Amino acid sequence: VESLRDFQNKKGEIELHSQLLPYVKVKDHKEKLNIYKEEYERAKANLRAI
Amino acid sequence: EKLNKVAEKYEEEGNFNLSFVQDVLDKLESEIAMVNHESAVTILDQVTA
Amino acid sequence: QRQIQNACAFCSKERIENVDLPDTQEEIKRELDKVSRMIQKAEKSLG
Amino acid sequence: RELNQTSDLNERKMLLQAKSLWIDVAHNTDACKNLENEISGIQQKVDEV
């Protein structure tokens, strides 16, 4: 019974971790998006002013 | 809410990454699969009675 | 030449192309870390 | 058997390091080839002038 309870608890824990990891995944994706956007919109502004 | 709180916890520690999360997953998997897990409870009740 | 010497310091390229491995260094590092985790797990489970 | 498996894993990690170094070799060769192409172009300009 102890082994079974530990099994259930750790299954719940790993499920929670797999659920959460997309948090930082989406944060990193946003960083790749937002930073690139700002930089190269500034770049397009440079060429438009030129 | 709980996942956001754990997100704050991990990112304060820097743990919120595929590396740490996957390592915890694999550690618990190793501890579960190797340690193979009503019969117990029922037999215990019979024993006690 | 320097990286060739580093690679030839252990094993030779003949076996290097015999084993699949990512070109990105980050995946190599992650696999190395996982190998280290398995090292520690075996050292502690088997004493 | 876990000890043998982990010995194989450690040899695989040595292979990981060696493959990383050979991939660095490949990248440096590619950069050298690109610089050689630049040499070819600039000397073609020298020939034109």
Q: Which two tokens stand for residue A13?
A: 């824990």
DSSP state, residue B14 = T
Amino acid present at D16: L
CB D21 within 8 A of CB C3: yes
Tokens, residue B11: 């990112």
Q: At what angle do helices A2-20 and A22-49 cross, to 10 degrees?
A: 10
C29 and B CB contact within 8 Å: no
Q: Residues A42, B35: contact at Cβ < 8 Å? A: no
What chain B residue is nearest to A6 in terms of C-alpha separation? B32
Q: How many CB atoms lie within 10 A of CB C42?
A: 19
Resolution (Å units) = 8.0
How many whole angstroms separate alpha carbon D36 and alpha carbon D40? 6
Residues from chain A that touch B7, judged by Cβ atoms under 8 A, are: 20, 23-24
Report whether D13 contacts C36 (CB < 8 A). Answer: yes
What SS3 state is found at C41?
Answer: helix
Angle between helices A2-20 and B2-13 (to 10 degrees): 80
Question: What is chain D's Cα-based Rg?
Answer: 21
What is the least distance, in Å, from the CA of D22 to any CA of chain C?
6
Q: Residues in chain C, how many? A: 47
- By the 10 Å C-beta count (0-12 exposed, 13-18 middle, 19+ buried), B23 is classed as middle
Chains in contact with C, counting 3 or more C-beta pairs less than 8 Å apart as contact: B, D
CB-based contact D16 C25, cutoff 8 Å: no
CA–CA gap between residue C46 and residue D22 (Å, rounded):
34
C38 touches chain D (CB under 8 A): yes
Q: Is C37 exposed, middle or buried (0-12, 13-18, 19+ CB in 10 A)?
A: middle
Asked if C11 and D13 come within 8 Å (Cβ–Cβ), the reply is no
Structure solved using which method? cryo-EM
Q: Is A46 on the interface with B (CB under 8 A)?
A: no
